[PDB]
Design a protein around this nucleic acid. Structure first.
Ligand SMILES: NC[C@@H]1O[C@H](O[C@H]2[C@@H](O)[C@H](O[C@@H]3[C@@H](O)[C@H](N)C[C@H](N)[C@H]3O[C@H]3O[C@H](CO)[C@@H](O)[C@H](O)[C@H]3N)O[C@@H]2CO)[C@H](N)[C@@H](O)[C@@H]1O
Ligand SMILES: [Mg+2]
Ligand SMILES: [Mg+2]
Ligand SMILES: [Mg+2]
Ligand SMILES: [Mg+2]
Ligand SMILES: [Mg+2]
Ligand SMILES: [Mg+2]
Ligand SMILES: [Mg+2]
Lengths: 402, 154, 221
RNA sequence: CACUGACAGGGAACGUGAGCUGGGUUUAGACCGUCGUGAGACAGGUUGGUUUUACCCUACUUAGCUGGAAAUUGCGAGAAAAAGAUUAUCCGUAAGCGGACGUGCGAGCGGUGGGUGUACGGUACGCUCACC
RNA sequence: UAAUGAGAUUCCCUCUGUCCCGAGUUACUAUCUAGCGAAACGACAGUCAAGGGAACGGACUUGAAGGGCUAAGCGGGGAA
RNA sequence: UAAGCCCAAUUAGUGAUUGCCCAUUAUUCCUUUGGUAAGGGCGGAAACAAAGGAGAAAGUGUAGCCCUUCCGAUGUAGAUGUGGCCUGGAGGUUAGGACGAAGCUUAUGGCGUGAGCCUAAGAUGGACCGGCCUCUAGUGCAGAUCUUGGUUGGCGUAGCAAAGAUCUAACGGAGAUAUACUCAACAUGCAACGUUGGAUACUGGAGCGGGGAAGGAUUUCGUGCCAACGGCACUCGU
RNA sequence: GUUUGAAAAGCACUUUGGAAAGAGAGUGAAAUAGAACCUGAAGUCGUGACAAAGACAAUGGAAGUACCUCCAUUUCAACG
């Protein structure tokens, strides 16, 4: 007999299996489509999540009820130290797939790059990339570098480079990892001879985030969801909770199937891992590509808001610290907790809708505290509400006593 | 009348045996089978480390829904435990076997534990009281352990 | 499957010559899909090692729309309880042919698994198969003797590209690049092919004449 | 009655009680009407009336470990591969064509050594040990 | 028929997590270890689609799956 | 250019037969077994030492008196036959056993269609017992929600979750501070017991207070003591 | 059933352990006759040595083969 009333089923069935991610980092399963009429350019960049805040900006949207009026939008801060290129891979088309031809290396690799090869670096011989380093400038090894660079020019359709996050310029105390996060970034643009020349030129040289993205564009954010353990069916799938007088329990799915087919189906919601899942989340509009504090002591300062202040709030981002490097600022949320490495990748969606072409100018960036209720935008404003306090008048008493 | 196996050279091999241990059979099974190829001093080291809970006893036959632990990757297992009452009763038996090596004239630092065998003893009867007026058994299941150890030197 | 160091040191302790088993390589351009599959399913099960090549060129009788619907009725089948345990629907022409061979084998015994792993079934002609001897053909299954020429037929590479099989264009550029390469190799040695036949006509009258009228009785002149 | 773009019709042991609920049918109490001499009857009305067990196999959900292409073995040799496949340095294309350390002492491409500044802090680039 | 009722029913006020529509915290469990240690149950066992059949198969016919072994769940089957 | 439908062939207008694949059927050849079975031989023909051989019974049924011939053979419920098998005891006969009987054990073969029998080996046993003819019966197990004893998977699993709660130091105790080297200690003896002191709580006078009935009948008390019991523990204990 | 053995000759003594016990010695024809002790079954279990083996649950039939075999029988010279 049919179900007596209709509701749409619970949970998208295309995000199955809802199992833990195989790896903690965001990894692109597909790059944008290669336009060979463009100029060669990188397509992804790894940033780390550093809390979130909100902004104020006026809206250019003709027809809308909020046209030329100021909105408050939440933004997420993603710290981006530059990544250093260490390799060049090239992939050739087969009827099986897309096979790797080989990789050249940079002749000089970082300590934190070849730390990724060790479960224990400090208690080790540390001699990785040590025979490749010395063979690469022999007579036969300078041949073998140019041997496989030519094999890219013959067989490869896809040229990628291998970068790593360069975590020692990320002077962060809470991201506790010291080995670098390694991914491959695909070159798109030009023919294969024009991709390798851009792959050779930025080799053993750091690439900075504002050379990959622009200020008022969008991107995809490949990132791994915040993990929540084993959760039941109400938290995980969002099923309705049963009436109060139910025996053995409320937070269950009552019927898990008919008598026939005499099996539980994959469509029936069950309990298990919730969170720590990979998500791609397209069309994340970017609002500000920031600049390091060694360059910019005044990061959150706008034309329309001349308060001299950085992007880091009062008392720091909660659980994270201070944004010490370049940063991107995206509209809204990205999947994952703070401190987690995330991949900003160029969009595969058509970036032609009038919401996505819109140029962004800000008017205010909230640099108030995220601990408690934020009240002051700078520490100069808290020293004008509060005058000299007691601990200041006895520090001024030690400074006169000397 | 009890030893399943005899040593090669009995003049270089010390025996030890427990009559009725009154530990659990299914825990003294794995406490004792893990030392069946070890030297005497490496087998004694393992038991002082199971008590400190730094190494574990791999439960490979009578495991059956015990919790899985991080320390059983030493033995190629996933689940093992720290059965401290079967451990410290096997330490009294390794100390008997090495006392039986000294009075034979042998160096106990060269003794490899050949032949561990644990078998089931006669069970002991108690009683538990269930619902609705029922009475149902509460057995003990003790064990028989035996070992020699043969000296292998030079 | 690359050979391990146990399988590589024994080819150095014993000085193993490079070995190739007796492998029959069928060129399946313009073959009936199930008539070639039944000839192959019997030979594999008589102990023949068979490499099958050019599976995107196999033909199935009928309109392309007809045979494409019969694959989509096959793709309608899946285990509803758990489709990861379901019928697995292979879209490559090289994998459509392996299935059609396999459904003619005793698949659930070891003798029929030793015969389905004797079949390889590439599509296009890969670089390891090109220079390993002349390809063979199945003349009782070749569409010009088996299909009435007024009836439509269906190339398997075209039926399969519209139901899946995202490597149609890759195969078409690997086989355009081969026939260009293999026709450059064949304009070469045309002064080697003509060199021998102008030496095998010149070997006559340089050889004794009592071995030529026995070479003309059997028609080998 | 009202909203809606619309409030389609059904199946799955009249899907689904170790999922629930127990209103209703479907006991023992009691009342009423009609019936019966009575005990009682009533696809008649009424009220009150224990809903037990998973720790097993599978299925499904997640979570670990780990072999194996003769799917454990045969030594049973098949590369979506190079092109001496007959001897043997590479580079770049087929006709062509670039150079390739010379004989324990030397040299060359090089991994690590000492002192006064350059590119986007510390890594690179100037000017004793292996191999040819 | 006033008074009385752990009696049966209906509406209204106050009231609220009964509900919209769920969330979050606590104690105790579960869960992991030490000690101790059962029972129910048990032909043999245990992946499915269709066909046939004592006319709802785990075993038979033809197909489709299936590397081994585990921990926590769970209530679709075992006409449990 | 069927591997579909309807007709038709048998290697094709060539000259005449039966393309070939599969049975517990058919034909035929062996072996068994039973007949409403059918025949023959059974007065030792002669002869023959060791250093051509053995048998030959007047017979229902045997290791069938021996040959030759012919036909049948499955079967539930059921009937019957069996010089058919097996177990306890009895009457007779003939033999085994401390140089190893019964019993038990089995990659111990042998042979019987079979029920079964017999040999061998026990690094098993330690005193009884076999074969044949008769006689006798408490005489043959796989299942009766069979009886009694034991064992087993589940399974080191479910659990041992009401009555708030214990901590500390010193002593006691076998219950520790327990280590093969070239090791300073942590990372290689953990957990758990009693007593007194101290800290912290609880019961809260309808008390985990102090006495009696009924019921119990030594649980009282001291001293030893820890096998089993006090569902964990014990050095404590009703 | 107490039926250990012919007879307690019922394990002195040694040294590990707090002890139960263990390792040796000893008695006896026998201690794998050591105390509810002759024989010591089946089921079930441990251990040493091996044989292997995907997932067809297992068992089963037929017919070969591979390896094994404290088994039987036959054959070894102008002979089977
Ligand atoms: N191991 C396989 C099994 O052997 C069993 O039987 C075995 C045992 O019953 C039998 O016992 C052996 C005996 O062979 C051997 N020659 C002497 C030994 N005394 C016996 O052993 C007997 O005595 C010892 C102690 O004395 C006991 O521990 C043991 O449990 C007992 N079986 O050895 C037989 C094998 O030869 C089962 N009959 C059978 O189910 C199975 O095949
Ligand atoms: Mg977390
Ligand atoms: Mg009253
Ligand atoms: Mg009968
Ligand atoms: Mg009887
Ligand atoms: Mg508890
Ligand atoms: Mg109080
Ligand atoms: Mg107790």
């Amino acid at each position: 007999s049919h179900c007596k009333f209709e509701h749409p089923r619970h949970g998208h069935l295309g995000f199955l299996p809802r199992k833990r991610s195989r790896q903690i980092r965001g990894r692109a399963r597909a790059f944008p489509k290669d336009d060979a009429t463009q100029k060669p350019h990188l397509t992804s960049f790894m940033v780390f999540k550093a809390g979130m805040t909100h902004i104020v900006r006026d809206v250019d949207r003709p027809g809308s009820k909020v046209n030329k009026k100021e909105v408050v939008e939440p933004v997420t801060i993603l710290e981006a130290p530059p990544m250093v290129i260490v390799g060049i891979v090239g992939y050739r088309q087969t009827p099986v797939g897309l096979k790797t031809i080989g990789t050249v290396w940079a002749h000089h690799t970082s300590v934190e790059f070849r730390r990724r090869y060790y479960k224990n670096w400090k208690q080790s011989a540390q001699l990785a990339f040590s025979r490749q380093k010395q063979f690469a400038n022999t007579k036969e090894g300078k041949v073998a570098e140019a041997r496989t660079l030519n094999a890219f020019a013959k067989k490869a359709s896809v040229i990628r480079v291998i970068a790593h996050t360069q975590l020692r310029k990320l002077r962060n105390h809470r991201v506790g990892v010291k080995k670098a996060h390694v991914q491959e970034i695909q070159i798109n643009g030009g023919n294969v001879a024009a991709k390798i020349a851009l792959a050779k030129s930025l080799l053993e040289k750091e690439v900075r985030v504002d050379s990959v993205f622009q200020q008022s564009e969008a991107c995809d954010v490949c990132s791994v969801t915040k993990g929540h353990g084993t959760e039941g069916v109400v938290k995980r799938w969002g099923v309705a909770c049963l009436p109060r007088k139910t025996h053995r329990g409320l937070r269950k799915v009552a019927c898990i199937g008919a008598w026939h087919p005499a099996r539980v189906m994959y469509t029936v919601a069950r309990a298990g891992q919730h969170g720590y899942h990979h998500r791609t989340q397209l069309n994340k509009k970017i609002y500000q590509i920031g600049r390091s504090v060694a360059v910019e002591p005044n990061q959150a300062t706008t034309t329309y808001d001349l308060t001299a202040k950085t992007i880091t709030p009062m008392g720091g981002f909660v659980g994270y610290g201070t944004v010490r490097n370049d940063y991107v600022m995206l509209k809204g949320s990205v999947s994952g907790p703070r401190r987690r490495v995330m991949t900003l990748r160029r969009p595969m969606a058509p970036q032609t809708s009038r919401h996505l072409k819109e140029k962004i100018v800000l008017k205010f960036i909230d640099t108030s505290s995220k601990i408690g209720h934020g009240r002051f935008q700078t520490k100069k404003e808290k020293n004008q509400w509060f005058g000299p306090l007691k601990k200041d008048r006895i520090r001024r008493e030690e400074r006169l006593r000397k | 009348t009890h030893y399943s196996r005899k040593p090669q050279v009995s003049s270089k091999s010390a025996k030890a045996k427990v009559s009725d241990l009154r530990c659990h059979y299914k825990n003294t099974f794995e406490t004792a089978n893990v030392i069946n190829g070890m030297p005497l001093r490496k087998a004694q080291q393992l038991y002082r480390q199971v008590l400190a809970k730094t190494r574990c006893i791999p439960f490979k036959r009578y495991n059956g829904k015990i919790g899985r632990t991080a320390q059983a990757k030493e033995w190629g297992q996933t689940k093992g435990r720290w059965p401290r009452k079967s451990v410290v009763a096997m330490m009294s038996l390794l100390k008997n076997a090495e006392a039986n090596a000294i009075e034979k004239g042998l160096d106990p630092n060269q003794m490899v534990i050949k032949h561990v065998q644990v078998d089931q003893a006669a069970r002991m009867r108690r009683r538990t009281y269930r619902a609705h007026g029922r009475i149902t058994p509460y057995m003990c299941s003790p064990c028989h352990v035996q070992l020699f150890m043969s000296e292998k030197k030079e | 499957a690359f050979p391990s160091r146990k399988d590589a040191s024994r080819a150095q302790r014993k000085s193993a010559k490079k070995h190739r088993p007796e492998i029959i390589v069928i060129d399946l351009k313009d073959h009936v899909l199930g008539r070639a599959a039944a000839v192959v399913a019997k030979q594999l099960l008589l102990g023949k090692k068979i490499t099958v090549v050019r599976c995107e060129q196999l033909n199935i009788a009928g309109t392309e729309i007809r045979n494409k619907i019969k694959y989509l009725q096959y793709l309608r089948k899946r285990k509803l309880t758990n489709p990861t345990k379901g019928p697995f629907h292979h879209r490559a022409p090289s994998d459509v042919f392996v299935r059609t061979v396999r459904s003619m084998l005793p698949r659930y015994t070891k003798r029929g698994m030793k015969a389905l792993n004797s079949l390889v079934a590439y599509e296009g002609i890969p670089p390891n198969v090109v220079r390993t001897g002349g390809r063979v053909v199945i003349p009782r299954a070749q569409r010009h003797v088996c299909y009435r020429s007024e009836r439509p037929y269906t190339v398997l590479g075209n039926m399969c590209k519209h139901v899946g099989w995202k490597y149609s264009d890759v195969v078409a550029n690997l086989e355009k690049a081969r026939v260009e390469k293999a026709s450059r190799h064949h304009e070469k040695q045309a002064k080697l092919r003509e060199a021998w036949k102008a030496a095998r006509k010149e070997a006559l009258a340089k050889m004794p004449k009592h071995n030529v009228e026995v070479l003309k009785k059997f028609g080998y002149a």
